[PDB]
Amino acid sequence: SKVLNVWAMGDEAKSLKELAQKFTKDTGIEVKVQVIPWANAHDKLLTAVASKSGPDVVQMGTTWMPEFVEAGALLDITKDVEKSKNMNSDLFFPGSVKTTQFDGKTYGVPWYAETRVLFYRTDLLKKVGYNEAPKTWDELSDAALKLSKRGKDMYGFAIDPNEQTTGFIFGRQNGSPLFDKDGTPVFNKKPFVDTVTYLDSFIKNGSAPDTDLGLDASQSFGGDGIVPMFMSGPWMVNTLKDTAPDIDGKWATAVLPKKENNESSLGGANLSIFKYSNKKDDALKFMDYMSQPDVQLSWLKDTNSMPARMDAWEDDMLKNDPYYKVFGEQMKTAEPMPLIPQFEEIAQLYGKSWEQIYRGGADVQTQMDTFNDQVEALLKKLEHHHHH
Ligand SMILES: OC[C@H]1O[C@@H](O[C@H]2[C@H](O[C@H]3[C@H](O[C@H]4[C@H](O[C@@H]5[C@@H](O)[C@H](O)[C@@H](CO)O[C@H]5O)O[C@H](CO)[C@@H](O)[C@@H]4O)O[C@H](CO)[C@@H](O)[C@@H]3O)O[C@H](CO)[C@@H](O)[C@@H]2O)[C@H](O)[C@@H](O)[C@@H]1O
Numbered sequence: 187s188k189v190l191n192v193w194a195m196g197d198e199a200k201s202l203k204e205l206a207q208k209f210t211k212d213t214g215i216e217v218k219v220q221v222i223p224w225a226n227a228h229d230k231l232l233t234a235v236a237s238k239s240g241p242d243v244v245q246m247g248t249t250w251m252p253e254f255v256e257a258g259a260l261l262d263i264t265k266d267v268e269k270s271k272n273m274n275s276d277l278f279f280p281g282s283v284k285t286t287q288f289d290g291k292t293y294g295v296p297w298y299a300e301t302r303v304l305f306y307r308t309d310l311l312k313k314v315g316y317n318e319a320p321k322t323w324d325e326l327s328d329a330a331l332k333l334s335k336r337g338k339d340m341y342g343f344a345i346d347p348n349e350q351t352t353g354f355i356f357g358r359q360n361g362s363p364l365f366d367k368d369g370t371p372v373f374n375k376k377p378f379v380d381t382v383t384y385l386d387s388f389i390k391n392g393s394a395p396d397t398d399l400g401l402d403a404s405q406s407f408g409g410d411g412i413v414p415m416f417m418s419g420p421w422m423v424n425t426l427k428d429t430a431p432d433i434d435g436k437w438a439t440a441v442l443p444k445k446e447n448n449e450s451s452l453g454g455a456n457l458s459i460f461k462y463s464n465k466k467d468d469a470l471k472f473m474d475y476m477s478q479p480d481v482q483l484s485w486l487k488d489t490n491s492m493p494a495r496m497d498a499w500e501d502d503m504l505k506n507d508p509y510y511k512v513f514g515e516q517m518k519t520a521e522p523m524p525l526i527p528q529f530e531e532i533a534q535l536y537g538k539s540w541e542q543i544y545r546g547g548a549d550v551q552t553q554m555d556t557f558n559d560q561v562e563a564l565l566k567k568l569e570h571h572h573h574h
Pocket residue numbers: 195196197198224246247248249250300344345346348349350416417418419421452453454455
């Protein structure tokens with residue numbers, strides 16, 4: 187009734203729940219945190235919109251902000267965050283702020299950022315002649331194939347078929363804008379088509395697994411390094427340090443390999459107030475509480491997570507820790523996925539087309555024509571909603 191309901195995701199939800207104890211101690215506001223896996227969170231949010239009942243505070247994946255702003259699910263908090271020492275936009279990376287601001291109105295406060303980088307086994311790269319991480323698409327292909335040639339059930343590089351960012355990241359690296367200046371999808375034009383060919387090359391030549399092997403990060407990257415290279419975010423630094431002691435000093439991260447560029451994705455999460463909340467005041471207090479820079483830095487550093495607030499990167503560990511140095515370097519040019527309200531739907535369509543290619547053996551051009559058409563059809567449906 188007076189309990190503040192907070193919906194949060196994954197491992198970071200534990201830090202939120204723990205920080206919430208002191209908030210309750212200091213205010214007398216009881217907090218209930220529902221911990222939702224990222225794989226289920228989109229559906230949970232759709233259900234909340236359809237029933238107009240949900241939490242008071244919601245942790246929003248950055249890529250879902252356009253969707254849920256457009257759906258009218260997130261409170262416009264522009265006036266409230268403008269007046270705040272700790273939630274004003276000027277504190278946050280411009281890319282992170284782009285995930286919160288639509289048509290001049292602010293719909294959340296950045297909570298953490300992330301970007302994707304290359305994880306690699308330094309010992310195993312050295313053995314196939316790479317003293318440094320692969321720096322180009324050609325090198326990543328070459329190193330991966332040499333690594334897969336260790337033997338039948340040994341690989342070189344992972345492509346996560348459920349990762350929304352992967353095809354879009356590589357596409358931009360090869361000069362695809364993904365949507366052109368007019369908003370027309372261009373997933374069937376040469377830059378993107380060659381991107382998907384390149385990703386499929388690892389599958390077809392046996393250097394990326396073509397099924398889920400069912401190994402944890404420790405078992406695939408650790409030991410003899412069955413999967414000796416992959417792409418992920420800060421959460422994997424923390425996971426590997428905790429779970430793979432056998433490769434201590436035998437792995438590192440590096441910025442992504444380049445094609446025309448090496449741009450990564452900018453993501454993370456924001457805190458937002460659900461528009462139907464009866465406790466908007468207490469929601470805002472919680473957000474402000476959670477935005478205190480020392481409270482933030484404490485859990486961020488402990489988890490190797492990336493702050494969205496700029497001045498946090500002046501902290502000595504963020505400047506000097508090897509993992510943070512690489513994340514900070516990549517963050518410089520990291521861009522959010524297209525900030526469009528059908529993003530998840532489009533990413534899941536990409537996932538199905540990817541599956542058709544890597545598992546079904548579909549032609550990449552034919553499949554990308556099919557995918558692009560699907561995307562244009564979605565966009566036209568939304569257009570028709572805006573034009574009668
Ligand atoms: O897409 C919505 C939202 O996601 C935000 O990303 C979250 C991230 O979630 C991603 C999820 O990660 C789960 C992890 O999977 C591993 C991959 O991260 C890794 O790169 C890959 C290596 O090839 O191996 C996978 O196993 O598994 C953990 C359980 O063991 C989960 O705790 C973790 O959530 O991976 C999915 C695809 O496989 C992605 O769809 C999903 O987005 O989880 C992070 C940890 O909680 C979190 O820090 C991150 O913010 C993204 O930031 C945001 O911009 C998007 O809107």
